[PDB]
Amino acid sequence: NLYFQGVAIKLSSIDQFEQVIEENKYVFVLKHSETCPISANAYDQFNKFLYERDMDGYYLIVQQERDLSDYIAKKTNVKHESPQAFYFVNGEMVWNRDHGDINVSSLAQAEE
């Protein structure tokens, strides 16, 4: 529908992922699948939340970026799911959710 000010920015490498979580104090990252209604619902929630917050966040297409997807799993010790959202504060994970638990209210709770 709308493009939500392009608040969701694609990551294509481990280099960019590390760069992002270093450069930004507060960072949300979404693992997204391109062939999944459940993932699209999560991506929509992700965009609605970020747009309302006036905050950039990041996503990756799991299938296209498996290195990066597995890197995030090892970064957080959280086994891979899709869709799966993470919140990093000063580079350290502090929250994650997957599937239908990714919604505007849970993303908001992550910040509290």
What residue spans define the domains of the chain? 1-112
Sign of CA dihedral 35, 38, 39, 41: positive
| β pairing state of 26-32 and 57-61 | parallel
**CA–CA separation, 2 vs 107, rounded Å?**
20
Residue 69 sits at the vertex; the CA angle it makes with 66 and 75, to the nearest 5 degrees, is 140
**CA–CA separation, 29 vs 94, rounded Å?**
12
**Answer CATH for 1-112 from 3.40.630.10, 1.10.1750.10, 3.30.70.360, 3.40.30.10:** 3.40.30.10
Structural resolution in Å: 1.5
Q: Name the experimental technique.
A: X-ray
Residue 80's nearest CA partner among 95, 94, 66 is 66
**SS3 readout for the chain:** CCCHHHCEEECCCHHHHHHHHHHCCEEEEEEECCCCHHHHHHHHHHHHHHHHHCCCEEEEEHHHHHHHHHHHHHHHCCCCCCCEEEEEECCEEEEEEEHHHCCHHHHHHHCC
User: How many CA atoms lie less than 13 Å away from 3 in the CB half-sphere?
Assistant: 3
**CA–CA separation, 14 vs 47, rounded Å?**
22
